[PDB]
């Protein structure tokens, strides 16, 4: 019943509204399996022609996949491996949030390369996420 | 004596048992277990003959058994009774075997290995029949004992893969029995054997086990061919569920050979030829594969003569099986030269030879094919040729008669000629020149389609082994 | 001899296996995602080369 | 001690056996599809990583 | 379309070349993973000794 | 939106078909090229089983790979002739 | 009674047989229950089996010998597979060589070469040199003449098979039709026209009226005393065009190029 | 030997000969499936014909031949139409082939109709014969002494009646601790599997009432339900039970869990 609001936010031409569209999916469908939710963020993350909107959609993905917090490293491996700095920045934050609640070693194994990554804000995001 | 021999034989078997045991009890990887049983077999066959025939029994007592031991004992009596050094205190130990479990764990009766060991124990029964090459009791007794027990299992993935190989032996000894002696009971038991395979085809499909599905299908089609019912086999292949999913290439080679026979006699030679070429390719090439190679090379050539083609002369001479392809070198020649007289004379000698390999059936229709080849020569030499001239060459009775024969052929579009009855000649109408028609677009559709097929196949298979290797530990 | 129950497998199918089945639906979704992502780096690959 | 050739749960398990492949069958169906998708996912992963 | 056909075959050899070369790698990897199992024994023995 | 457009001759050109004198020339050059690079690729597989991948790359010219070079050459030509047959056929059916 | 059919057969009146056929089939339930229907033969059941065999066989032969074609066809066809597998591997009768011959003959009147081989192959194991070919050479040589394209020899065979007429006459009428038809389908690709004399001689018509009647049925016009096969050619051609199958089958040039393009794009 | 003679007698007409021939075929139905796969429309006609008492036999012979082939949709349509000797299949391990399909086919149809109207249990769109299969399978499930089976298959087709019936009959304090264990498991299953709100909410409302209805249960399970749904009328009702029963230790603990767990 937020699916209508979401449509309009990603169809906007302002980079601000697509960024906040990503958390509109995040919070609407949080902790709950929805097909619409996971598929749309994944599309937004890749396809867009702005870099902030990529970053945001990844953080959004762990909010949708909150309860299923062990499946996040599988999906976001590709997004850790990325050529896009901002993609990578949002990947670290995503594990950060998702697996926040209790230890998950698998996540750490993912974030160990991201710690040592030579993009500076990738470092900043991984250093933070690990401790959560 | 007895104890020294039987423990030493058993020890070599126990090593083989631990290989199978780990895979089936941790859930199978389909492709790798299937291959290990094939290698297993060769060692086991030699071991049973060696160091007494009561070692198999001795092994049974030692390992955990719910009552499997009594099945091995009855078998032992047929091959001459032995029961010494095959009983407890010469044939029991619970320690170091997790394939019986420890002394303490047997007493608790909270452990289960009676299942998985029973399935393999049946292999020994089935081998012991094969090693001996005896029949009698062994044909009927092994068939009876083992089969209700595969239907006493609920039928798991691990367990179906194993019991697939028990069927080969049940089939081979029944057939071998049937051929040896004539009674009506053998015909009677033939029906019940077929039905059991059909039942079991349906159950394993539910469970999605491929090894079992393929196996039954192959054995039962041979049974239809030997009785000569095309109708049953043609209904059986149109059910159309034969698996390529988790099979061997030998299995594929087997299947294709049966389809070729059915398709060839249902007068669709194009497709029968295309399967028999593939049957040879898919099949391994070795000297333990010599029956298959010999009979598939024989059959293929009979299929080309049925088309109207001539197999290569060079096929027969450079085959190292040239001795048995002596009849076929002769037929290929008789058909080429077009002589009616030569074709009759050749088949009269090698009537028996052809009857063995089930290529005599093909040859009755090759009588028709003589005439056709002979007028294919006539079409290529002469473009306008009076009716009389054809009759003088080919010794044909009347001018009217040879026109009827040419009409039949040009209906099927092989000779591609057109008769002028009034004007008293036959005029070849073939001249091709078909790059001017749109037909080369259709030829090009197939080649691109063919190339496409490989481009999908490599891709799907290639990433598959790589996954495991990264997932697994490395040095 | 033996000690097994059949009760346990059947229970595990209604309870535990259904939650694994939600997870297999997600791997389907992943499958779809890496088609669009593969196409995208292909667009970018061309753009880099130019 | 323990037994199960007497049938544990007092021959409820016996009853259970008749209907048992209805439950397995539905799952066997899904799993077959799952084996093909697992590798299909890796396959486009692999390719994607090249890009 | 004639020229398109010859090109399509030529690629079929490249694509099969890639397949051949992976299977060689996997062949080797089977052996390397096997070696780890043996090598552990060698490592374990040292701790006990020293 | 203004930048993307560059007239109506942007799209009209997709239907527009060049001289067929040119097509034949391009396809000719490409045919020979693939033979000459197939030979270059033949040298690549001359043996190529000695140790270390890096020493093979330098030795048998795996740097500036002949396999990759064949692949690109084929694809450009294959796809081009695909569009040319399609636009021709489009033209036939559409006009008359 | 089951014995009613036997005495009507021997008398040599076969019309009377066909009214006894549903009543004696109610009784054949009981005979069926005294045999294991070939799946549990024993020497007790073999004795009952022999008794049942005599009823089964003289009822097949009776139907062919019933003097009208309509009567032959409907009942003989039902009976044909009925004795097929209430006789173990065809038979311990002496009636076998005639009956088996009749099985093969029937299929050729219906023009099915595929089914004829499928049937022939089953028989083939138990008849080969164990019964030879004595009357069984009549349907096989008959097949052999039509496969060669020698419809002249197939014509003659039937004529000479009616100087040894028993109950062969129920098929000879049907089998004369099969020859004249096959020559007619073939010669569409072989001629463009024949006069009325020449079309008679070639396809073997017997009477002048038969020459023109067979024309209307194979849909060739007669114009100036001449039959034209070219018209059949065209008639075949219009049917192809009324296909809705033909766009995708032949394939538009435009579809082919698209087809190749998209395989790559996957 | 073959099925060919048996088929031959159907084509002949005489009632009594057709009827024996129908029973003959039916003995050998999965034994000679092959040769009755071409001539199967001939049995279908005997099922259409109305002056047979063996009409039910005719459609039984059809269901079997189809499942064997693997054509479960033709197989089901005639399975439900025979209405005879389908009950024995529900006693056969090797012929749950068609019974598994029936159950799965039911689940497919039911879930669409619940959504059109929550009540639909008076409707005829799910066949009466399918219903009788399904509800028999429920009886057997709860008889195996795991209620997860019976709850879990009903939960899929969005059948709620089947859920209530199962639960009432577990009710009688077989063990008070065990019964409460069954309510907890139902709550967990329903939130995760069923991601349609409509059926998810309905299950959670029903469960609470079974717990209230029984005089003693662990009140941990009650606290979960009121949080999952987020309804305040259920929350007033839970404190109203504990006002009558009294004891501050018991009420506060439940409340103390309520404050962390729930919405502002």
Coordinates of C-alpha atoms in Angstrom, one line a residue, chain F residues 36-85:
Chain F
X36 CA 45.6 -15.3 -41.0
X37 CA 44.7 -14.9 -37.4
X38 CA 43.7 -18.7 -37.2
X39 CA 47.3 -19.4 -38.2
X40 CA 48.5 -17.0 -35.6
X41 CA 46.2 -19.1 -33.1
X42 CA 47.6 -22.4 -34.5
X43 CA 51.1 -21.2 -33.3
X44 CA 49.4 -20.5 -29.8
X45 CA 48.5 -24.3 -29.6
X46 CA 51.7 -25.5 -31.0
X47 CA 52.3 -27.3 -27.8
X48 CA 51.7 -24.8 -24.9
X49 CA 52.0 -27.3 -22.0
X50 CA 55.2 -26.0 -20.4
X51 CA 55.1 -24.7 -16.8
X52 CA 53.9 -21.4 -15.4
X53 CA 51.1 -19.5 -17.2
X54 CA 53.2 -16.3 -17.3
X55 CA 56.1 -17.7 -19.2
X56 CA 53.6 -19.1 -21.8
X57 CA 51.9 -15.8 -22.3
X58 CA 55.1 -14.1 -23.4
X59 CA 56.5 -17.1 -25.4
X60 CA 53.5 -18.1 -27.5
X61 CA 52.0 -14.6 -27.7
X62 CA 49.2 -15.1 -25.3
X63 CA 49.7 -11.4 -24.5
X64 CA 47.7 -9.7 -27.3
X65 CA 45.8 -13.0 -27.5
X66 CA 45.0 -14.5 -31.0
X67 CA 41.9 -16.3 -29.5
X68 CA 40.4 -12.9 -28.4
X69 CA 41.3 -11.3 -31.8
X70 CA 39.5 -14.0 -33.7
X71 CA 36.5 -13.6 -31.5
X72 CA 36.0 -9.9 -32.1
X73 CA 36.6 -10.2 -35.8
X74 CA 33.9 -12.8 -36.2
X75 CA 31.3 -11.1 -34.1
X76 CA 31.5 -7.7 -35.8
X77 CA 31.0 -9.3 -39.2
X78 CA 28.3 -11.7 -38.1
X79 CA 26.2 -9.1 -36.5
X80 CA 26.6 -6.6 -39.4
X81 CA 25.5 -9.0 -42.0
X82 CA 22.5 -9.8 -39.7
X83 CA 21.3 -6.2 -39.8
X84 CA 22.0 -5.9 -43.6
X85 CA 19.8 -9.0 -44.4

